[PDB]
Amino acid sequence: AHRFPALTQEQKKELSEIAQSIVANGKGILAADESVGTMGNRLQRIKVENTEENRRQFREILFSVDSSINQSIGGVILFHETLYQKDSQGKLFRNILKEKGIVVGIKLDQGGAPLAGTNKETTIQGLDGLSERCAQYKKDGVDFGKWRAVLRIADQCPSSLAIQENANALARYASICQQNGLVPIVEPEVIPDGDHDLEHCQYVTEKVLAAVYKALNDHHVYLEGTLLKPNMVTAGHACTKKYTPEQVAMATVTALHRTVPAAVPGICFLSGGMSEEDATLNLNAINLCPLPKPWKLSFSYGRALQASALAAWGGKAANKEATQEAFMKRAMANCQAAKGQYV
Amino acid sequence: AHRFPALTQEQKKELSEIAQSIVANGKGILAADESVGTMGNRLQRIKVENTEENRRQFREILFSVDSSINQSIGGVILFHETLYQKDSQGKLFRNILKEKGIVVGIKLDQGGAPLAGTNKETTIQGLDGLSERCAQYKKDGVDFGKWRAVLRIADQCPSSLAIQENANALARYASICQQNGLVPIVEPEVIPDGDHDLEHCQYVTEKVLAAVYKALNDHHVYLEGTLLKPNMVTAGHACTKKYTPEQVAMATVTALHRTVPAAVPGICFLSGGMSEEDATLNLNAINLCPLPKPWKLSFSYGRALQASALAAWGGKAANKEATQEAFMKRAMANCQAAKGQYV
Amino acid sequence: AHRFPALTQEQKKELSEIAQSIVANGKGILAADESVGTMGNRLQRIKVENTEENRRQFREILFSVDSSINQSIGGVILFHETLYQKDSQGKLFRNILKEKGIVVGIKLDQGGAPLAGTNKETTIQGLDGLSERCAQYKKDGVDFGKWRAVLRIADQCPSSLAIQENANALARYASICQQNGLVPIVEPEVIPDGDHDLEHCQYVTEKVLAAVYKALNDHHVYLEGTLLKPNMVTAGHACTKKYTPEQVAMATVTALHRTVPAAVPGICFLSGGMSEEDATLNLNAINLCPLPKPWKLSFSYGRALQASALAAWGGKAANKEATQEAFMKRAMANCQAAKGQYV
Amino acid sequence: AHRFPALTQEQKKELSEIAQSIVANGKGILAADESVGTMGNRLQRIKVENTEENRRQFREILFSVDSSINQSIGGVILFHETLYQKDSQGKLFRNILKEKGIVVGIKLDQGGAPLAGTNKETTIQGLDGLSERCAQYKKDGVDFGKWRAVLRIADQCPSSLAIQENANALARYASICQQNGLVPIVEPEVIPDGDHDLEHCQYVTEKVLAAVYKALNDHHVYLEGTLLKPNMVTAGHACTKKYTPEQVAMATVTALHRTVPAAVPGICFLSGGMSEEDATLNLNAINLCPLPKPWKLSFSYGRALQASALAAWGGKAANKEATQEAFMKRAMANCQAAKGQYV
Structure with a gap:
């Protein structure tokens, strides 16, 4: 400049x-950054009481998987509490992931704030004091951060x-992250309210x-x-109209390349409620598009990599191998369907 | 709408x-909202060490003036610590001001944050968790708040x-304050930073x-x-070119009414380094302008009302009568030169 | 700058x-700038054919009024063809108005242009070559110009x-006019398409x-x-509910002063289909508002000053004095209701 | 939408x-759209007088080249006067190019307009009446249009x-062109005024x-x-320091892909005074960049394809085959560079 x-x-x-090493060889991102309420909602589906010990146990099963997970996962997004926890043997999760070669990232938004005069649409809080937090995280073995901005489709929405406030908040977040050495992950998520x-x-x-x-x-x-x-x-x-992977892939790549x-x-996709198989098929169809696609399309998946793992866990011991294999299978499937090599 | x-x-x-009662009858604003470092800088000029007790004592003298100060001061801006401080007889400062009829306000910005890719330009932090703070202040007998945004004039500045970020931060601040019931005081301060x-x-x-x-x-x-x-x-x-009160008044009223x-x-003016006499004469000339001026021009003065008070106090007791009279006289003079009646 | x-x-x-002399003492603007199609539409209401001769004759009657009309009319907006017309003798219409003391202005837009991807929204053409036209008009005894930008209220409108394109077009027009010496008259007209x-x-x-x-x-x-x-x-x-002059004045002044x-x-109001009596009453109520109103509110009226004139003329000969009296009555009524003195 | x-x-x-057929197989654009003054300036370098007949003759030599020029040139930009000229025979220039397979385009801007309050930087006129002109050109066998917006690098420039006015003018131009069926060629040209x-x-x-x-x-x-x-x-x-083709290439592609x-x-490059050999070398280096480059980089060259042609012609008769060979050589070299195969 x-x-x-x-x-x-x-x-x-x-x-x-x-940023490139996160998505180097078709690898994606495991989004194990659910907050206390989000993790409680995820745990409620298998009748498991929400507590810090359950979160620590499940994240330990997730992070103590076979060392051949750096071939499918290149980065892991964490929460502030989860980054500083320990495994059963006595070492940090952020170090277990580091010796595997997985890049570490942190959620960096503090939440939603109502935007007055607007139809139920909010802006994102977390900007004040973000530079010090990012510097501390960079000192504490964290290489990238993630920030989510919600924009809704409704009457007079967005x-x-x-749009202006959310884009500028994302841009200020990204500039702060890059000033502190972290790679920012912009997450502009468009959520429909009414029928469309x-x-x-x-x-x-x-x-x-x-x-x-532009911001x-x-x-x-x-x-x-x-x-x-x-x-x-x-x-x-x-909605009655169910869109095939081809139509979804065409729409999203058309939106992206414009x-x-x-x-x-690289462009890592979120799930937002899709099933694991649907997400894998959709991303495979995305990577099979004839459009230019000058980026490295991959996945930044939450529930999609942690749906069969929750079902196999059930909050009980002796299911560690089952949960590890259920997460292994989904990670490998998405890694295959991040290069258009999924059947 | x-x-x-x-x-x-x-x-x-x-x-x-x-908002009208703050500036109802030529009344102004006493800006006793200096932070710990700012109050230490003010106290350093009279050989008084900076401590929490000296800040308590001086504002105790300031808020214990004769009850005929509502005729000159309509609002007082405080700091977070000073709001919850108590009088020597065991009464809250904000309650003392409320029984005197003076409206209560609070400083509401958390500070400055560097803006990357800019020539030492900063934005203002304080937006996250501002609605809860404003609601707490409103339940705590605070009726208005203040937020400062600094814009500098330098090479390629502003x-x-x-401009965009500072204006949008001020606007988001104002919307939050109005949603919580507080009157926002926008303070866009254009600092010289040169010889323009x-x-x-x-x-x-x-x-x-x-x-x-616009924001x-x-x-x-x-x-x-x-x-x-x-x-x-x-x-x-x-710069060596001085400006008479007429030129300053014409320039500022011209800038305001466009x-x-x-x-x-109402438009309450800050000082930012002007002497007490210069501020009083300048505001008198502002209120004597032939231009339309559809607002109630007034003063929101800090050091301008607390400069002779500092010189009369000296950090010692038994001089509090001189401290109260040096602030009574200056506030009365500014109230007189808030309607063009000052000689 | x-x-x-x-x-x-x-x-x-x-x-x-x-600009001040146009609105000096409660004087308004006579908007006799109807285009060929527009003037034909206004002439069609009294069963007279649309032709250049009829347009010249009616504006001859309008401009051949007693020299006391400078006490009620301060400016006249003409069309390009009407500015160069004659008063049946060797003296031009523009000179007829100039020796009467009335300021001369010209319509300066070419008009609507579809704005693609919008719900029937249009922008305004006239910018290219505007500087040369404005210089020619200024050499031709024209002192102000007018530009109209239409914004509609509908689904996803405006x-x-x-908004941005129309505001920037108005601003570019005004800058060109002021560069050529003409006073620009911004006309942002908001037209509702539906039941608002x-x-x-x-x-x-x-x-x-x-x-x-802002633009x-x-x-x-x-x-x-x-x-x-x-x-x-x-x-x-x-609209189902009618709005009294007090309510319309309240809403208008409230919108203006923010x-x-x-x-x-000065702010000169247009008509947009309201009757002459309603326009006069509404402008009187606007000028009777207790709000600050730092401008000189007046009228820039079209049909409101040329409704009884058209009905009295009828296109016939010797029906001139009736048109003169009707136009004088409407102009005097609006000038009286441009300072809150109309009963 | x-x-x-x-x-x-x-x-x-x-x-x-x-748009794709213009740049289908490494083909570029011949920018023979110089205005009367511009073509006179280019003709003055070979001591030939500026007249319509000289322009007709040189455009004839340019457009009467072997039909294999469709393997190097995919589009030709013309002027309004040039499109309607003849080939000294029954056929028009536009039909001569059409049966050669070359796509036809037209210059569509009226040009600079001073922007008041700015340091000698202008906006572009041409928008009013552009829809009708574009419809006429589309009926007249013109498939694309071109619009140039100049932004200068100086003190407080751009x-x-x-920036906003030029971007919005280019966007409005492009929307009009696409509404009329023409492919718009945005030309944002940044010209330095000083030492950058x-x-x-x-x-x-x-x-x-x-x-x-964004616009x-x-x-x-x-x-x-x-x-x-x-x-x-x-x-x-x-500039004191010369920049190698590798440095220029990287800077250009780095600027483009962000x-x-x-x-x-496709992205077709202009010349801006850059020599014929330097333009070809720079374009080849651009097409040899390791960066993604998701477009079809090519050339839209003016003087670069018409510098040896002007020197070979000289305005004299029977010096035609030299002009044909020079234009063919430059077009073939620039096409080879646009495919990144120029040695």
């Missing part, structure tokens, strides 16, 4: 290596104020992504040292 | 009464990013105010329940 | 004198694109005006040398 | 085929106003392109049916 650049050559280089179709979701996603990357350019954010976590362009789950620059090293 | 208004009729009415002239400072102030009120309109902020705290349009003290709507009940 | 000001002291002074409410119309008008003056500030437009021509906040003819700066010398 | 899309499936498909750096030029180009494509998305412009005509990130002729979406079918 001539006289006042945001980063230096070393910082840009380090950010690019981190408004110009919501594929074309409207694609249009709104294109608008959101255009505003997001990122405005804040001088290094695009080669950041990742994108968008939702796949789908419809409301309470708005997302080629400087972004 | 057809389907999703920001406020209701009762909230709008209450905000308008609070940039578009700085009156024309450039006036131009930059007009740009800042236009962007600030306020974007965030649906009730303009009748806000106050503005702008700097008087002056030049950098490094950008500040008539809905704003 | 320090290093690169838009205008000089002489240009700013001349623009301010022109959109952000329509008073609150919705007020909110949309505030948004439009805030964006318009005007962005383009460095001298606000003291320009006029505003807004529509009163009213209801459509299909967004229109005090630098604007 | 869901309810108000800019184009239909047939219009989008036709625009896609036209300003926010210049490669880093500064790259940064300014990135900001310009980000704003341009294009704001106006709902089909990105798969448009082309981009940027200048290579180079240095001025007064801001230009993958939906854009």
